[PDB]
């Protein structure tokens, strides 16, 4: 098996959409059983919370559902995941710093948008935006997730 953890600051908007998009992808390709997929937060502030309703509604528009509840990344995640794919530069900075406080970091830590063929590198926080911003995130996630499944960096 291979494993990937999608991360943003709060684990309520972007990373639960990424997680759900990627889970749909590996189920559609009949290889769900060879993947451990999760999402998590830099911050502990939103722990326990369901995804933003606008993320739920966006996923529903695309026939996808998630049961995810927000959790904070742990030191153990750095030792167990093959890939930690995050949304923006703030996330990358925080994860790289946290990476440096663990003895063994197995995980490669990359921006999810570094996989985008259309080269939009940052998946911007939609929380203060509107439902069109959630849809842009979903579409970016589709492109990046399918590029990552094809070939990892």
Residue numbers in the entry: 5 to 157
Tell me what the authors wrote about this structure, in their words.
LMW-PTP is a well-characterised phospho-tyrosine specific PTP, widely expressed in human tissues and conserved through evolution. The ligand-binding interface of LMW-PTP comprises the active site P-loop, the adjacent DPYY-loop (D-loop) and the variable region or variable loop. The catalytic residues C12 (nucleophile) and R18 (phosphate binding) are located in the P-loop, and D129 (general acid/base) in the D-loop. We demonstrate here that minimal re-design of LMW-PTP, by mutating only two residues, is sufficient to introduce new enzymatic activity towards four different phosphoinositide (PI) substrates.
Mammalian lipid phosphatases (PTEN, INPP4A, and INPP4B) have a conserved lysine in the P-loop that is important for substrate binding. In the LMW-PTP-WT this lysine corresponds to an isoleucine in position 16 of and thus we used the LMW-PTP-I16K mutant as starting template for RosettaDesign in DS2. In order to assess the actual impact of the designed mutations on the protein structure, we determined the crystal structures of the I16K and L13R-I16K mutants at 1.8Å and 2.0Å resolution respectively. In both cases, the structures are similar to the WT enzyme with overall root-mean deviations (RMSDs) of 0.288 Å and 0.265 Å respectively. There are no structural distortions in main chain of the P-loop or the variable region, thus the mutations introduced do not alter the tertiary structure of the protein, consistent with a catalytically active enzyme. However, in both structures, the side chain of W49 is in the open position, away from the active site, thus confirming the flexibility of this side chain as suggested from the kinetics characterisation. Importantly, the crystal structures of the K16 and R13-K16 designs show that mutations introduced in the new enzymes do not alter the 3D structure of the protein or the position of the catalytic residues. This ensures that the catalytic mechanism remains unaltered in the mutants.
